Write a protein that binds this ligand. Structure first.
Ligand SMILES: *[C@@H]1O[C@H](CO[C@@H]2O[C@@H](C)[C@@H](O)[C@@H](O)[C@@H]2O)[C@@H](O[C@@H]2O[C@H](CO)[C@@H](O[C@@H]3O[C@H](CO[C@H]4O[C@H](CO)[C@@H](O)[C@H](O)[C@@H]4O[C@@H]4O[C@H](CO)[C@@H](O[C@@H]5O[C@H](CO)[C@H](O)[C@H](O)[C@H]5O)[C@H](O)[C@H]4NC(C)=O)[C@@H](O)[C@H](O[C@H]4O[C@H](CO)[C@@H](O)[C@H](O)[C@@H]4O[C@@H]4O[C@H](CO)[C@@H](O)[C@H](O)[C@H]4NC(C)=O)[C@@H]3O)[C@H](O)[C@H]2NC(C)=O)[C@H](O)[C@H]1NC(C)=O
Ligand SMILES: *[C@@H]1O[C@H](CO[C@@H]2O[C@@H](C)[C@@H](O)[C@@H](O)[C@@H]2O)[C@@H](O[C@@H]2O[C@H](CO)[C@@H](O[C@@H]3O[C@H](CO[C@H]4O[C@H](CO)[C@@H](O)[C@H](O)[C@@H]4O[C@@H]4O[C@H](CO)[C@@H](O[C@@H]5O[C@H](CO)[C@H](O)[C@H](O)[C@H]5O)[C@H](O)[C@H]4NC(C)=O)[C@@H](O)[C@H](O[C@H]4O[C@H](CO)[C@@H](O)[C@H](O)[C@@H]4O[C@@H]4O[C@H](CO)[C@@H](O)[C@H](O)[C@H]4NC(C)=O)[C@@H]3O)[C@H](O)[C@H]2NC(C)=O)[C@H](O)[C@H]1NC(C)=O
Lengths: 207, 206
C-alpha cells in the first residue's frame, strides 16, 4: 500500500516574515489502478481547506506520487500548533494520519566564522571558502552565500551535526575558480537561526 | 510486523587488512510474545554459518531487537560479492531477505587540507581545528585525529556530502582548549579511502 511522509516548513521561510512557511504531506507508492487520493489537513484538530495538492505519475517506477502543501502562519508554527494531514485511498484499509509540530526546547545562537582557502589549495585552479557555524540549538538553520550583495549559488552545506558539547555545527563550502577569490572585494556568509537577534547574522571576509 | 535492515562493513575495517569487516542485519519490532527469529546468511547465494546473532529486549518501547553480524573477507567485499540475510519469524507471512554489495563505480582520491582555527576564535578559551577532505569517489571515507601519535577523541565528522563537481567532501572538527592548540607540537588528520595509495594519507599541522 501507499506510504505517507510529512515534512516541516523550511527554516528560512519560518524566519522571514515576507516568505510563506508550508507543511508538506507526500504520498508515494500509490497504484496507477487506484490513483485517487483524498488529503485532509488539520491545524490543532481543526480542519482547514487551504492546501494545494498535485498528483504525478512516476514513470520510472510505475507508481503515483501525490504532494499536498499546506501554507501556514509563522505564529502557529512558532507557538507549537500541530499540523496533521490525513490520507485516504482505495489501497488503504483505514486512513493514514501524520502530524508534525515545532518541538519546544533549548535555544542558543550560533557563532559564525569564515575560514579562507588552505594555502595548499591556492596553487590549484579552484578554491573553497568555508563558513563554520557552531554552537547552536536547535539544529535547524539556513546558511547562504553572497558576493558584494550578489547571490552565490555554487556552495554546499553539510547537514547540521550534533557536537560533543550538545550543540550543533554546520559547515558551508563555496566553490570558485582561484581568480574569483583574488578578483573579488568581499564574500558574505548569511546565517538565519531562531537564536539570533533579528533571526539573521551576516559575516563578511573582505580583501 | 518485524522489519529488517542490512548494513555494510565500516570503511576502515574494509581498508585495513588487520581488521575484520562485518556485514550487519538488524531485525526490529519483533514481538515479545514471539521472540525467536531465524537469520540465515548467504554469500553469492551460498549459505554460511559464521555469523554471531544476539537478541535483546528493548524495554523503552516493548519490542525485541535482533542483531546478526557476519564477518567477511576483504577481497569478497572489494570484488563485489553479494551478502544476503534471510529472516524468519512467526509474525512474518514469508521470510524477509535483504542483500548488500560494494557498488562498482569511479574511484577518485581525496585532497586533504587542514584549516587552522579562525582568527576571531583565538580570543576564546576553546578552538576548532578543521580537516577538509574534498574531491573523492565513492563517498565512503574514514577520518580520525591524532596529536604526536596520541589518539584524539573529541572530534566530529560531517557525513560525506555530494559536491558540485560530482565528487564528495567531508569536514572533520577537532575541539580543544586554546592552550592545547598553542602548546601542542603537531596535529594530524588521518584519512582512509580506497582512492589513496596504501589506502591511507596523513596530513599534519602546527
Ligand atoms: C518510486 O519512486 C518514488 C520517488 O522516488 C524518486 O524516483 C525514483 C524513481 C528514484 O529515482 C528515487 O531515487 C527518487 O527519489 C519513491 O518515493 C520515495 O519513497 C521513500 C519511502 O519508500 C521515501 O523515503 C522517506 O524519506 C524521508 C526523507 O525524505 C526527504 O529526503 C529524501 C532524501 O533525499 C528525499 O528523497 C525526499 O524527497 C524528501 O525530501 C524532502 O522533501 C520535502 C517535501 O517536498 C521537502 O520539504 C519541503 O520543501 C519545499 C522546498 O522544496 C518547501 O520548503 C516546503 O515547505 C517543505 O515542506 C524537503 O526540503 C526535502 N528534503 C530533502 C533532503 O531534499 C524519510 O524521512 C523517511 O524516513 C522515515 O520513514 C521510514 C518508513 O518508510 C522509516 O523507516 C524511517 O525510520 C523514518 O521513520 C520516521 O522516523 C522518525 C524517528 O526518527 C519518526 O518521527 C517518524 O514518525 C518515522 N516514521 C515512521 C512511520 O516510522 C523515508 O526514508 C522517499 O522520500 C520517497 N521519495 C520521494 C522523492 O518522494 C518510491 O519509494 C518508489 N517506489 C518503489 C516501489 O520503488
Ligand atoms: C523500538 O525501538 C527501536 C530501537 O530504536 C532505539 O530505541 C528507541 C526506544 C528510541 O530511543 C530510538 O531513538 C532508538 O534508536 C526502533 O528501531 C529502529 O527502527 C527504525 C525503523 O522503524 C530503523 O530505521 C532505519 O534506519 C536505517 C539507518 O539505521 C542506522 O542509523 C540510525 C540513526 O543514525 C541508527 O539509530 C541505527 O542504529 C542505524 O545505525 C547503524 O547500525 C549499523 C548496524 O548496527 C552500523 O553498522 C555496523 O557498525 C558496527 C560498528 O558499531 C560495525 O562496524 C559493523 O561492521 C557495521 O555493519 C552503523 O555504523 C550504524 N550507523 C549509524 C549512523 O549509527 C535506515 O537506513 C532505514 O531507512 C531505510 O528503510 C526504510 C524502511 O523502513 C525506508 O523508508 C527508507 O527509505 C530506507 O529505505 C531503503 O533505502 C535504501 C537507501 O538507503 C534503499 O537502497 C533501499 O531499497 C530502501 N529499502 C526499503 C525497504 O525501502 C530506516 O530508517 C532504525 O535503524 C531502528 N533503530 C535501531 C537502533 O535499530 C523501533 O522502530 C522501535 N519500535 C517502535 C514501534 O517504536
Amino acid at each position: 500500500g501507499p506510504s505517507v511522509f510529512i515534512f516541516p516548513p523550511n527554516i528560512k521561510d519560518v524566519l522571514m516574515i515576507s516568505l510563506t512557511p508550508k507543511v508538506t504531506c507526500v504520498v508515494v507508492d500509490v497504484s496507477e489502478d487506484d490513483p485517487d487520493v483524498q488529503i485532509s489537513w488539520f491545524v490543532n484538530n481543526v480542519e482547514v481547506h487551504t492546501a494545494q495538492t498535485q498528483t504525478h505519475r512516476e514513470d520510472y517506477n510505475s507508481t503515483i506520487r501525490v504532494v499536498s502543501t499546506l501554507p501556514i502562519q509563522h505564529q502557529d508554527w512558532m507557538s507549537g500548533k500541530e499540523f496533521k494531514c490525513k490520507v485516504n485511498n482505495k489501497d488503504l484499509p483505514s486512513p493514514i494520519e501524520r502530524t508534525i509540530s515545532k518541538i519546544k526546547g533549548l535555544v542558543r545562537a550560533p557563532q559564525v566564522y569564515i575560514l579562507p582557502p588552505p594555502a595548499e589549495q591556492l596553487s590549484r585552479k579552484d578554491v573553497s571558502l568555508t563558513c563554520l557555524v557552531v554552537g547552536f540549538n536547535p539544529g535547524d538553520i539556513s546558511v547562504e552565500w553572497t558576493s558584494n550583495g550578489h547571490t552565490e549559488e555554487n556552495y554546499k552545506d553539510t547537514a547540521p551535526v550534533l557536537d560533543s558539547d550538545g550543540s550543533y555545527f554546520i559547515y558551508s563550502k563555496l566553490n570558485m575558480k582561484t581568480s574569483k577569490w583574488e578578483k573579488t572585494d568581499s564574500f558574505s556568509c548569511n546565517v538565519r537561526h531562531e537564536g539570533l537577534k533579528n533571526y539573521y547574522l551576516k559575516k563578511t571576509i573582505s580583501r
